Design a protein around this ligand. Structure first.
Ligand SMILES: [Cl-]
Ligand SMILES: [Cl-]
Ligand SMILES: [Cl-]
Ligand SMILES: [Cl-]
Ligand SMILES: [Mg+2]
Ligand SMILES: [Mg+2]
Ligand SMILES: [Mg+2]
Ligand SMILES: [Mg+2]
Lengths: 520, 520
């Protein structure tokens, strides 16, 4: 019934033309080229037509670097770049040049600052915040930039980092994350007054700005694949969007590529080879990064990482879409059942594919004897533009912001079956911030299915992330949305619950205009 | 009569202890070590005792990097570092990392920005001023920094550079110079209104701030040694202090080392081997830089330059001191006679020494078949601290600021012979900004000999620099001092005369508190 490329409507074509495609290349032409180029690099007969078919059915979203650069001379097809900053000017300049080159090329960058000695240390040093000014300037000066720096909450310079983005502060452009350990938080909860005041200030900053990001470093490291545990490959920090969980060091900067399965069609593709085909595709994308980076000035640490690890980040979008297509409320037991099923299925299929890839092409150095091609397979990145392109489905695992901001097609259908598909009804929804909770014509059950992100239990967001985390070898970009009237006490408990449940990170805390945190 | 090391008085010892010497090394111990280390590297018997003797007599000043680092593990013994910035992010990052590493190590840095495409060029670019923000931040963040950027007056972005240091401007820390060609200035003088307004603005900026530096690029290139002309090795820019005249390129960053002859004792050392010994010393200093830099991250372009060129910068101090010791007024025909004699003698002796060095050790690559060891031998750097250390003699070729600010020892002697060496007389001099022009007890002849920098013809400063330039293969750091009441018209003519007479640069325009420009 659904035509091939239904998703590729006039909105999507325009978006792609204006953003990603070279003048004189159409969207369809580009998809065919990508499919054929991948087949050629894999050496697998029939691969292109399989990949093309799955594209045609709307099962795959490809990352913007892949749309822009895959199979072409320009740019790189990677979606993150994470550097470790050693405690020396030499190593600071190495990272500076990486960030510069990547800010020109694009795909976001990040770095770990926590091993830089703090302000006042003998060399007297100016500390880690002082060096953050260099990266903030690099991205101010060079663009295609976006950069995130990570600092430990126990670091000598934490107070300086907590004023990033405040009025007049030197740092206005770069983002940051704070690495927070289990023992530190247990000391805070047990009553330590300094930790209690620092934590309070961090929460105040996050309400005011959305940031810092939180990196629960002990959850991240406890959740690493065995290979990284076996070889003491510590995850110091995450990436620009907080979903990546890969080790960086003096000799290696993590990189990864991404593309995403459209969960709207889970019941169509769950027993197909679509996830495996996408895994194969991401592996050839990494082969391209390796080939392109081998002679690229300043990218030697990333070239090394990609060569030895071959880390991939296959993600998802359309989670809320899938739930709505099945008349399931986001915060429900039935949603939790589907969450387990979907992510279990993806874990199994992507791992199987990585095992087959090692049989065909060999294990990279870090995985010799481990039996797969890729150190990691899955990560749940944000997908705002990618979701738009692919039929305006819901972003990643996030609830729809609202029903009308774009009209929710499942709400539309429901309104049509009730004869309520009228300008007056829709205008009422627009005037209520895309909510339907005001509408007396809808049952409570129907209202539940179409709650907005703001109306949904934020505890349910966290719990669902915790539930699926066991099936995801990297991480998940998890946003929450909180009313500005929310007591600090309630935010405090939500973040503490996040760490307790094993979440490796939290991304942005969004606000809205003037029980959702403590019940699900 | 004069004791050995008379110059090394308690002031000098304290200065050296506090600035340059490692805890537990005395000034004398350091001098002996430097002499012996140089002998060892030259393989020349008796060299150390010759070098030590000349140090003992007060004939030599050594640069602060040499005092700090020569023969030791730490740092580098070079006094400039000049990079060419190619029009690419890659080449911008190469230069960024050079400047970072050198800002930690010390010795000043500089770079040429003029081949960066201007704001609005297709890639649309943000231009050369945008990239200057990166270097300004590097030196804000890393210290031991000082940096000077050079831009051509005809460059698309010249208006942006001319607001450097103004209220709120992004650039407050780095210095800059403007490269001004002969044909451009002839177009300006012939009446071009745009050039006339731009030149007027530059002069306004220089009165207000002292800067930009002026680099007369056609004089600099016309004055290069034949070897650089023969091989099209363009001098794009000068260094932090405007005395260096060396080529930089995509593959080479200029470096040079310095030390200085004390002209107070010219009549003692003119027929000795002291200038030759100092030349030999500077060549072994460059051998140290080469050895140290060979495995230093990010310094490959400077290592290459030093290896192939072996450029040296032997300078002078105590010019005004020499004139005063001989009862010669700075602005006089007799001064001009001495200027010619001294600089002719130095040109001959340093070149002879470089020829002998090539016979002993070989010609470097750039000079194969040219018959000397070093592409350049002489440059007249500023010597404010070095002059203090060496008996408080006058700085470089500059007049003494004043007679009492430190008491002029020739004025003191003159006052003693007249019985005028009294607190009342000296206090009168202090109250008149170190001038003696008010004192009725002195003849006009005596007053002439002890005019302050501010009282001296600035045309004479320029003319003396022009006269000695024929004997100096690099350049000269030339400051002038101008009353704030001076009409723009008169400054205009002075700078135009500077270019007409063949000066390769001008450094700072100093001011003072409320015929000297047009007569000598
Ligand atoms: Cl990143
Ligand atoms: Cl494993
Ligand atoms: Cl320099
Ligand atoms: Cl020559
Ligand atoms: Mg083929
Ligand atoms: Mg650690
Ligand atoms: Mg020996
Ligand atoms: Mg040129």
């Amino acid at each position: 019934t659904r035509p091939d490329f239904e998703w590729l409507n006039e909105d999507s074509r325009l978006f792609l033309q204006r953003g990603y495609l070279l003048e004189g290349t159409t969207a369809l032409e580009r998809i065919r080229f990508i499919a054929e180029h991948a087949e050629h690099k894999l050496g697998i007969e029939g691969y292109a037509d399989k990949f093309y078919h799955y594209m045609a059915r709307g099962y795959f979203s490809l990352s913007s670097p892949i749309w822009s650069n895959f199979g072409l001379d320009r740019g790189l097809p990677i979606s993150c770049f994470g550097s470790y900053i050693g405690d020396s000017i030499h190593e600071i300049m190495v990272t500076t040049a990486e960030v510069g080159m990547m800010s020109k090329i694009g795909g976001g960058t990040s770095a770990y600052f926590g091993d830089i000695r703090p302000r006042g240390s003998a060399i007297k040093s100016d500390g880690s915040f002082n060096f953050s000014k260099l990266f903030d300037t690099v991205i101010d000066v060079i663009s295609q930039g976006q950069f995130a720096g990570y600092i430990d909450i126990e670091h000598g310079d934490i107070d300086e980092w907590l004023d990033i983005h405040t009025e007049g502060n030197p740092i206005q452009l770069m983002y940051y994350g704070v690495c927070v350990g289990h023992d530190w938080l247990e000391s805070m909860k047990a009553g330590d007054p300094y930790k209690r005041q620092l934590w309070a200030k961090l929460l105040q900053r996050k309400t005011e700005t959305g940031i810092p990001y939180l990196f629960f470093k002990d959850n991240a490291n406890a959740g690493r694949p065995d290979v990284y545990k076996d070889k003491n490959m510590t995850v110091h920090a995450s990436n620009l969007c907080t979903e990546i969980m890969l080790p960086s060091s003096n000799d290696e900067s993590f990189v990864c590529c991404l593309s995403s399965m459209n969960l709207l069609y889970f019941d169509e593709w769950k027993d197909t080879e679509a996830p495996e085909v996408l895994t194969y595709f991401l592996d050839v994308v990494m082969s391209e990064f390796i080939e392109k980076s081998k002679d690229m000035p300043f990218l030697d640490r990333a070239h090394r990482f990609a060569t030895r690890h071959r880390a991939l980040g296959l993600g998802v979008l359309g989670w809320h879409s899938y739930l709505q297509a099945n008349n399931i409320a986001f915060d429900s037991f039935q949603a939790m059942q589907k969450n387990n099923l979907i992510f279990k299925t993806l874990q199994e299929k992507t791992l199987k594919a990585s095992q087959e890839l090692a049989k065909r092409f060999g294990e990279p150095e870090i995985l010799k004897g481990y039996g797969r091609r890729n150190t990691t397979l899955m990560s749940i990145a944000p997908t705002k533009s990618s979701s738009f392109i692919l039929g305006s489905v819901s972003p990643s695992v996030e609830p729809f912001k609202s029903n009308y901001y774009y009209k929710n097609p499942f709400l539309e259908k429901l309104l049509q079956e009730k004869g309520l598909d009228t300008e007056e009804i829709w205008e009422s929804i627009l005037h209520n911030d895309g909510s339907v909770q005001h509408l007396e014509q809808l049952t409570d059950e129907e209202k539940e299915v179409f709650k907005t992100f703001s109306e949904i239990s934020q505890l349910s967001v966290i719990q669902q992330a915790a539930q699926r985390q066991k099936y995801i070898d990297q991480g998940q970009s998890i946003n929450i949305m909180v009313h500005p009237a929310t007591p600090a006490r309630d935010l405090n408990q939500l973040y503490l619950t996040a760490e307790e449940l094993g979440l490796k990170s939290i991304y942005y805390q969004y606000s809205m205009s003037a029980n959702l945190l403590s019940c699900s």
